[PDB]
Design a protein around this ligand. Structure first.
Ligand SMILES: Nc1ncnc2c1ncn2[C@@H]1O[C@H](COP(=O)(O)OP(=O)(O)O)[C@@H](O)[C@H]1O
Ligand SMILES: Nc1ncnc2c1ncn2[C@@H]1O[C@H](COP(=O)(O)OP(=O)(O)O)[C@@H](O)[C@H]1O
Ligand SMILES: Nc1ncnc2c1ncn2[C@@H]1O[C@H](COP(=O)(O)OP(=O)(O)O)[C@@H](O)[C@H]1O
Ligand SMILES: Nc1ncnc2c1ncn2[C@@H]1O[C@H](COP(=O)(O)OP(=O)(O)O)[C@@H](O)[C@H]1O
Ligand SMILES: Nc1ncnc2c1ncn2[C@@H]1O[C@H](COP(=O)(O)OP(=O)(O)O)[C@@H](O)[C@H]1O
Ligand code: BEF
Ligand code: BEF
Ligand code: BEF
Ligand SMILES: [Mg+2]
Ligand SMILES: [Mg+2]
Ligand SMILES: [Mg+2]
Ligand SMILES: [Mg+2]
Lengths: 20, 322, 304, 322, 322, 314
């Protein structure tokens, strides 16, 4: 597949890697 | 860009729920303030030129179930402007730094369609006085609200931030400064109770009169509008309970207008409402006994100390709605 | 999601049965009635002690209404992400209004929120206020969608939530006829020698129990014969082609063997009797407390 | 780089809100400090050479609704510089390590467009003493602000970081070190209230005098600037309410200018204001009774323990800004 | 593979901020440690042969605003080597694996350009004791930092990892093991304050003497270096306020070198300073009254609890920096 | 592919078995596990199988990477010193292909040994972490650590961890030998001082080394090394305190002395050329000053957590 981009979420952190 | 507008397009309501100003009983000062602040800049824009500016935010606080959202429905009905009905699920997002962009896009969409109304229902769930709550959500959402309401490079002209809360003493001092008119919505009096009975009876066949409604409104003291609505619904469902819990029936007089009766009458035919077809059922007439039974059946919901706290907040930083 | 429980499968609860019956059957069968000011009920709270057939009655309404059902719970509407435990409720009410008329069953509404007193204030306030706005709101027009809420602790709710719930119906402890009917529907189609007076004496003996307790003592009294078949020795051949039956060690031809050499479809299963139910009720103890009944009495006393 | 610049290009305001230095009443120390640190290096650059350097950061704190954003608007009006107005929505992003490059590109654009003024409204949201906040984004954005303000390889010369917060004791100690001048914006005194009344009334036709303005400024004890603005707004709104309740009109004097009066007078043309067309109305003059009614109707906003906390922070780590 | 070096080439500064060892007031132990860290292995390479190795990491810690970045500037000025000034915005990337490949390429460039100095300001942002933070960024960045600091197959010989942080107790234990020199930079003492006043005043013509500087240093009890810098800035800006808010100038001794004085003198010409053109400007000289007013106006920033935390960290794992 | 040309080292750092002070059980376990399958290959067949997993843990800075360097020196085998930087890529699937080709090259280069420093960077306990770069890599390492029947002859995995309680339980169970590296005792302290001083001239004796090791109560290996470094740097500071130099004995070897002596030539120190400066000798007072200066880098919470971990998984 293509590249994998790291994102950021919020808890109440983590890495939800939403790729393209 | 497209994602935020596609998520915030659902907040605009176009159904226009038909609640007129006559459908709300009492609240004369709140009615006058909302009437001028939504009608006069739309109808006569030449009266506010330069030094005189309209109201830029109204807080409607009080006990729960007093007609705050009903008054907001009346404003959304006879506003003739764009109405934004937002809540906690439409602004708060999962990602980091997404709720503030949603609030900014909401106010930018409301500024493109001037005049517009933003009805943030339950502002107490989004404002928690910045003391001890969640750091990211609390500080960033409240900071974006405080910047986006007036700010510096915003120039919010032609918007209105309607807010309805039940615990207004748990709001931030800056947010209480932002909301200009803090109008108290107190418990209704005898005239508003009789008016609520007269608008909740509708056009159903009843034998109740003006003195009957006055005695009913004298009996339902200490109640609220939701309690008056549920005793009206219970008194409306009492003849259907008399329909269902009856065996002896009776056909009186046009094309079999049949009604229940006592056991033993003129033509005491015993059958069932399942055997009764359509266009032949006649309900029993209303009286004061069904309304008194509903009043004795349903208990009030408002306590007596939160009213003292609401009176304390009114005497501190509140107007009078009456 | 469709169960198979009719109206007759619930024992007792006459007022709750007639209230749910009229409130979910009267619009869907007689559309010529609800016109004008006549609007159906848009909320029902079924509280009381736990295990007293609340979800069973909810499944009965889910069967007999012939409409779409939603049977989510408290743990389904609680997430760990920030602001994701309210979009689930929004999509729930959206898919409810998509398939109108619909019935929404929410279990443990006391555990859904935390009455915003001491717990997580942000999540509690957002969950509670999004539930209220999805219940009535302004542009949410909930007509035909019935919110059917059930709980075990009603006094830990919010004033706004108990205002949103119209009819607060109390599910009390079962009665004598309810206990006998629950025994009669729990025993099933097993070969039994029990009579109506035996059921009446059993229901007189089990006063103070619950429906789940009656179900588990019926399961115990049904499992005790097949338990005594396995946990016994010195079987006895009675009478027709090797009909074996366990007895005491030492009898008129007490054949000492196991159940492995017993041929299939010839082992005589002993019928269940009164002493199995007496052993079950002497083993099983009541589970409920005493102050919770006082709390239910107080809650009915100011929200009857 | 270019995507971040395209995202940050909507931060330079090109509106220039017309608020002059005479519009702000009181706050002489804050006025003088902002006046030197904005006007002097861009007007007389030959003085600041060698050992004399201008102020690189000013923090404005106090109770909510005192004139911090108004002073920022006056600075943005009379600055003649590229005024950067950012908040917690332009810096925080969704991706990993993209909120720091936003602040770096913001300070790079501020250095590329020197002299520039950066106004960060509500600095308490970004900086939270880095004790127990959300680790990655919070601590990285705090250390990125601390590096980009003075740092080592930056040498921020010509830029100015203005701060405006309501709760200043939640600021980080290093950020409080960076804000080298803590100016307390207090509640206004009698002369500032009288000047705010004279400014907010302004060119409105009224019979109010200096003694009336002095009595109003003596009457509004404990009020703030937004409270004075809303009581002036209510006093201006009251003649339209008198026009609404205007039975028995009286045409006094040119081209039929109608004026209400008592019911029954000379020329008492009893009608309403709905059928009267525009461009001929005459509003009644403003008296002190309408302003006293607005004072009795609208309450102050701030309480008397938040002022104690602000005075405690002032006497601990700040100076008095009159 | 070359774009990483192109992105990391912006971290090597070439401006050379002119901060010498005589500019730093005090901190003789930290200056001697930095001297024996950087000056000796390039000037006398015949001493560090065999089992004698130079220092491979120095952690500067203390209260906010004590001179850690100033000593970093002095090291970058007097080092005559490659100086790497990186932060959290130059290591964290949006993609996956680039956040560690950037650190690997940074240490590869530092080992390729030996002797080189890596200065990481605010090391507490990258090292957050890996117990509760973000899993990917925290664990991978901390482990790659440890491996690039010593590792197994790296052999970091000749590079120096400088670090300056205000929170030394929030470091990882492995990072604290890596930093083999914990140098505490405290608040300056009396002689350091007097020499800092002598440095910051400079060549400005003043009537102050060594006894005046001694009384100023005795007056500033508990001040920091930035506080001394801003009271010097305020006392230097005080003659501008003197020439602004005064009239009745007088030519003293030269093409009309006129000076503000008392109203009424030998030629008290009443005019404005704005009409006075440049180079006929004789501003009043500095006295001890202006510095006393600057001390009375500006307040110390550092509290007395963070000093206890730094003292506990010194008594736990720290040296002294005099 | 060809990007794994930096995971193997060809430097072979000269750290012998005598340089590692103390740690006798870990040293003999690593010694047998790296030598005896190469020494006597007939001893390991069938039931008596060699050790396929070795894990080292303890306080930070105790000799784990030093023992790995000693194994890489005295192993005579292909050393794969690789970490999480060469296992994760920007794409998808290549993060698994890297571990697959890594184990393929390690099986092709038998006998080899794989040393993973800081193995907790790969084991984030998969709570809510990155899925495609955490869980798939962990399952790939779990199925490539299944060489109890595949790699009976060949590779051997290592591990060095400062914080071992935050480790995945599957890979913890897959690592069959877990050796606890403690703080060194008095004899290890004395021979570590003897090794770190080395061929430097001194007047320190065995009693001086013993009282130095008795003074270092609770110190670590890196702390002992920086104390030795400070004691080596102290004569340079004494030369830098240049006052009243004095020539000793070839071709003008100068030495500073006390102020006021016989032949106290008062001059500077930078005016003299190199290779004629007779530096002062190492006493015990500069060592005591380095002890008073340098603080122990470990605390008591890490020690009790290490004790809890070894009493839970000894
Ligand atoms: N003054 C009133 N006139 C008419 N209806 C009212 C009035 N007050 C309350 N009600 C009824 O009570 C209900 C509660 O309205 P709402 O404003 O939603 O309460 P809250 O916002 O406090 O939950 C509404 O459905 C409305 O029909
Ligand atoms: N009144 C009742 N009538 C019929 N069945 C009942 C009754 N009370 C309990 N039961 C039986 O007990 C079982 C457990 O009840 P449950 O649904 O868990 O109670 P609740 O709804 O309070 O959680 C159900 O399967 C149901 O069949
Ligand atoms: N000190 C002041 N001088 C003049 N007008 C003021 C002052 N304080 C408040 N006002 C008036 O009240 C308004 C409120 O001030 P504003 O800038 O909104 O304050 P804030 O910083 O709290 O947002 C101003 O826009 C102005 O019209
Ligand atoms: N010890 C000091 N010696 C000389 N100047 C100092 C000293 N401490 C502070 N200063 C002055 O104050 C400024 C603030 O110190 P700085 O290096 O920015 O500290 P920090 O590392 O906390 O950011 C310096 O740039 C310098 O102008
Ligand atoms: N057993 C030992 N023998 C000799 N020196 C040691 C020993 N243990 C620790 N040291 C010293 O402390 C350092 C710590 O070891 P090193 O491999 O660098 O890191 P780590 O132990 O943290 O993996 C060694 O480089 C050496 O200077
Ligand atoms: F003080 Be203001 F509300 F910003
Ligand atoms: F504010 Be400094 F970096 F101590
Ligand atoms: F214990 Be070491 F830092 F690997
Ligand atoms: Mg409401
Ligand atoms: Mg403001
Ligand atoms: Mg610094
Ligand atoms: Mg190591």
């Amino acid at each position: 597949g293509g590249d994998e981009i790291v994102n950021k979420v919020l808890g109440g952190x983590x890495x939800x890697x939403x790729x393209x | 860009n497209k994602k935020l507008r596609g998520a915030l397009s659902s907040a605009i309501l176009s159904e226009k729920p038909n609640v007129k100003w006559e459908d709300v009983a009492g609240l004369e000062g709140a009615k006058e303030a909302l009437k001028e602040a939504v009608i006069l800049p739309v109808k006569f824009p030449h009266l506010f030129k330069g030094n005189r500016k309209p109201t830029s935010g109204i807080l409607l606080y009080g006990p729960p179930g007093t007609g705050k959202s009903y008054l907001a429905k009346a404003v959304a009905t006879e506003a003739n402007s764009t109405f934004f009905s937002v809540s906690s699920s439409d602004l708060v997002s999962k990602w980091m730094g997404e709720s503030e962009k949603l609030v900014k896009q909401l106010f930018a969409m409301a500024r493109e369609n001037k005049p517009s109304i933003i009805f943030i229902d339950e502002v107490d769930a989004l404002t928690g006085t910045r003391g001890e709550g969640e750091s990211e959500a609390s500080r960033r959402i409240k900071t974006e609200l405080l910047v986006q309401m007036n700010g510096v490079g915003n120039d919010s002209q032609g918007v209105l931030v309607l807010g309805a809360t039940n615990i207004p003493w748990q709001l931030d001092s800056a947010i209480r400064r932002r909301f200009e008119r803090r109008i108290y919505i107190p418990l209704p009096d005898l005239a508003a109770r009789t008016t609520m009975f007269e608008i909740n009876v509708g056009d159903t066949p009843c034998v109740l009169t003006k003195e009957d409604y006055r005695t009913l409104g004298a009996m339902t003291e200490g109640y609220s509008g939701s309690d008056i609505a549920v005793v009206v619904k219970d008194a409306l469902m009492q003849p259907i309970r008399k329909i269902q819990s009856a065996t002896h029936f009776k056909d009186v007089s046009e094309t079999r207008k049949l009604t229940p009766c006592s056991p033993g009458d003129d033509g005491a035919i015993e059958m069932s409402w399942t055997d009764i077809e359509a266009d032949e059922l006649k309900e029993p007439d209303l009286t004061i006994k069904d309304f008194l039974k509903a009043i004795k059946s349903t208990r009030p919901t408002v306590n007596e100390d939160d009213l003292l706290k609401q009176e304390q907040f009114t005497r501190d930083f509140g107007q009078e709605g009456n």
